[PDB]
Design an enzyme around this catalytic site. Structure first.
Site, PDB file in Angstrom:
ATOM      1  N   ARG A  27       0.820  -1.197   0.000  1.00 48.68           N
ATOM      2  CA  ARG A  27       0.000   0.000   0.000  1.00 48.68           C
ATOM      3  C   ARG A  27       0.861   1.257   0.000  1.00 48.68           C
ATOM      4  O   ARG A  27       0.479   2.281   0.575  1.00 48.68           O
ATOM      5  CB  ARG A  27      -0.911   0.038   1.238  1.00 48.68           C
ATOM      6  CG  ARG A  27      -2.289  -0.603   1.091  1.00 48.68           C
ATOM      7  CD  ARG A  27      -2.288  -2.030   1.593  1.00 48.68           C
ATOM      8  NE  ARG A  27      -3.566  -2.445   2.186  1.00 48.68           N
ATOM      9  CZ  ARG A  27      -4.693  -2.668   1.509  1.00 48.68           C
ATOM     10  NH1 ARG A  27      -4.739  -2.516   0.198  1.00 48.68           N
ATOM     11  NH2 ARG A  27      -5.782  -3.069   2.139  1.00 48.68           N
ATOM     12  N   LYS A  56     -13.186   2.895  -7.634  1.00 46.76           N
ATOM     13  CA  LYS A  56     -12.817   3.916  -6.685  1.00 46.76           C
ATOM     14  C   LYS A  56     -11.338   3.885  -6.328  1.00 46.76           C
ATOM     15  O   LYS A  56     -10.698   2.837  -6.334  1.00 46.76           O
ATOM     16  CB  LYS A  56     -13.692   3.795  -5.433  1.00 46.76           C
ATOM     17  CG  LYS A  56     -13.482   2.540  -4.595  1.00 46.76           C
ATOM     18  CD  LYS A  56     -14.534   2.451  -3.502  1.00 46.76           C
ATOM     19  CE  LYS A  56     -13.965   1.800  -2.264  1.00 46.76           C
ATOM     20  NZ  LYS A  56     -13.140   0.629  -2.628  1.00 46.76           N
ATOM     21  N   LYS A  85     -14.860  -3.460  -0.676  1.00 40.96           N
ATOM     22  CA  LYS A  85     -13.462  -3.450  -1.083  1.00 40.96           C
ATOM     23  C   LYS A  85     -12.660  -2.457  -0.250  1.00 40.96           C
ATOM     24  O   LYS A  85     -13.206  -1.489   0.296  1.00 40.96           O
ATOM     25  CB  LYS A  85     -13.342  -3.104  -2.564  1.00 40.96           C
ATOM     26  CG  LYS A  85     -14.430  -3.696  -3.430  1.00 40.96           C
ATOM     27  CD  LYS A  85     -14.403  -5.213  -3.462  1.00 40.96           C
ATOM     28  CE  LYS A  85     -15.687  -5.759  -4.092  1.00 40.96           C
ATOM     29  NZ  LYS A  85     -15.623  -7.214  -4.462  1.00 40.96           N
ATOM     30  N   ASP A  86     -11.356  -2.714  -0.154  1.00 41.82           N
ATOM     31  CA  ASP A  86     -10.421  -1.880   0.612  1.00 41.82           C
ATOM     32  C   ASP A  86     -10.397  -0.425   0.150  1.00 41.82           C
ATOM     33  O   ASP A  86     -10.376  -0.130  -1.048  1.00 41.82           O
ATOM     34  CB  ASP A  86      -8.991  -2.434   0.496  1.00 41.82           C
ATOM     35  CG  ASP A  86      -8.767  -3.703   1.302  1.00 41.82           C
ATOM     36  OD1 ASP A  86      -7.899  -4.511   0.883  1.00 41.82           O
ATOM     37  OD2 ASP A  86      -9.431  -3.886   2.348  1.00 41.82           O
ATOM     38  N   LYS A  87     -10.384   0.468   1.134  1.00 39.26           N
ATOM     39  CA  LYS A  87     -10.320   1.903   0.922  1.00 39.26           C
ATOM     40  C   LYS A  87      -8.967   2.228   0.255  1.00 39.26           C
ATOM     41  O   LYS A  87      -8.925   2.622  -0.919  1.00 39.26           O
ATOM     42  CB  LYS A  87     -10.506   2.611   2.283  1.00 39.26           C
ATOM     43  CG  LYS A  87      -9.600   3.797   2.624  1.00 39.26           C
ATOM     44  CD  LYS A  87      -9.817   5.009   1.722  1.00 39.26           C
ATOM     45  CE  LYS A  87      -9.192   6.262   2.316  1.00 39.26           C
ATOM     46  NZ  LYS A  87     -10.001   6.732   3.456  1.00 39.26           N
TER      47      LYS A  87
END
Length: 437
Positions: A27, A56, A85-87
């Site tokens: 990340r 997004k 889903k992951d931010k």
């Protein structure tokens, strides 16, 4: 090798692969974590539900839906997802929007959001309406070279491809949202202690929480002054607050302090402690040298419930004669070696695997007759039998990472079915602390 205490405190304590910990970080850049959903449903041209593909970037689903709901002036419910889903990532998924036309969403231009119509349907998109999730993760800042990393990847992969995939371990996040205490609570209840099971949830601070709330739990943890706790604990913690109140009128009633929380955690604690035991078992078996994609005498397998899913319902036990037939089905994807999730209706396996299972319940001093909480029967489970191997066939890609000159990067891209997590795949590749992840 070496494994973080964090993971050993929840049963896990090794790696199905003997490769070296690739290390590195994740990340680092939004695009370093791409997650693209795979749908299992089809839409038409009619229906009061507009179906859109949501893309997004570094957005939080709740926040987005709350934004779209304001723009379309509808309740948040009218906009639903198949799975959150992951931010911090670049994610694509299917969503549904009630009573909205295509043209309306063609005029919405949010930053780092892309909306594309897929069609319409009389049915909304409910949690679960997706097959799996394609992943494209990127590990950066590895203390190795592109050459030494690609080769390091191929080896970690090979063992994986051979073992069938990666172990179906219960991640450190499964034992608790921000604080992994479930298993810690489920263990006290079983033993009979409710003074600790209640306190471990009400109080018991973790290094993950802010030193403020971290000091709120610490307070009542050595004073048991729930009166103050209901004065210091942020409203954010409804469950903890609800329990302390029950303890203000009903002192020392830790037994019934759980009757304030819905059926949620109500049974998550015991299920945690089970997941815990299950992890240990999965390891011991990996140590015993018995692979996860091969059956032995009295191994106990499961089959797909005619829906393409392994269920702990119909479980045939392999013997010295059906052994040749069982293994033949594994390679055909029609059976899976399973491990026990201890309860009071558990069927230990036989042979070598049976020894492992009984050897974990033994040292752990676990008692099957204990999974029947007297104070809270509804809270007592009988046990289940989850699979062991987590099918995965990753595709690595090594190289030099610009963001970190001199270091290398790894591009792990694979896919998992709804209900499975990427961390479970990454751990065998990075072998690092779950928090450094």
């Amino acid at each position: 090798m070496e494994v973080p205490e964090i993971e050993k405190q929840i049963g896990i304590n090794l790696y199905s692969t003997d490769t070296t910990g690739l290390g590195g970080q994740l990340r680092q850049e939004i695009e370093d974590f791409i997650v693209k959903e795979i749908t299992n449903r089809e839409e038409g041209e009619e229906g009061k539900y507009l179906i859109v593909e949501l893309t997004k970037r570094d957005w939080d689903t709740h926040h987005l839906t709350r934004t779209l709901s304001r723009i379309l002036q509808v309740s948040q419910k009218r906009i639903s997802v198949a799975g959150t889903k992951d931010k911090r990532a670049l994610t694509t998924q299917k969503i549904s929007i009630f009573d909205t036309d295509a043209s309306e969403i063609e005029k919405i231009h949010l930053k780092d959001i892309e909306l594309k119509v897929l069609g319409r349907s009389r049915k909304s998109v409910e949690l679960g309406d997706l097959w799996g999730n394609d992943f494209r993760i990127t590990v950066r800042n590895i203390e190795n070279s592109p050459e030494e990393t690609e080769a390091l990847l191929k080896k970690t992969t090979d063992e994986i491809l051979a073992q069938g995939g990666v172990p179906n371990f219960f991640g450190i996040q499964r034992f608790g949202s921000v604080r992994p205490v479930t298993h810690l609570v489920g263990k006290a209840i079983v033993e009979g202690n409710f003074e600790k099971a209640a306190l471990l949830y009400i109080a018991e601070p973790f290094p993950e929480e802010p030193e403020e709330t971290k000091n709120a739990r610490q307070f009542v943890k050595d004073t048991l002054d729930f009166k103050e706790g209901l004065k210091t604990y942020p409203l954010r913690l409804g469950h903890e607050r609800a329990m302390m109140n029950h303890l203000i009128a009903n002192p020392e009633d830790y037994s019934g302090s759980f009757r304030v929380l819905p059926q949620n955690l109500y049974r998550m604690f015991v299920h945690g402690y089970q997941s815990y035991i299950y992890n240990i078992i999965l390891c011991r078996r990996i140590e015993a040298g018995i692979p996860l994609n091969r059956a032995v005498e009295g191994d106990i397998v499961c089959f797909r419930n005619e829906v393409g899913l392994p269920d702990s319902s119909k479980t045939e036990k392999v013997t010295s004669e059906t052994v040749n037939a069982m293994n033949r089905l594994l390679k055909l994807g029609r059976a899976f070696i399973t491990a026990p999730l201890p309860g009071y209706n558990t069927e230990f396996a036989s042979g070598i695997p049976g020894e492992i299972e009984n050897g974990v319940l033994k040292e752990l001093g676990v008692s099957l007759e204990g999974f029947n909480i007297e104070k809270f029967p509804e809270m007592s489970s009988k046990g289940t039998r989850r699979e062991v191997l987590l099918e995965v066939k990753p595709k690595f890609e090594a190289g030099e990472d610009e963001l970190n000159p001199g270091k290398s990067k790894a591009v792990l891209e694979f896919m998992l079915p709804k209900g499975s997590y990427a961390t479970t795949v990454l751990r065998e590749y990075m072998k690092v602390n779950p928090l450094q992840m």
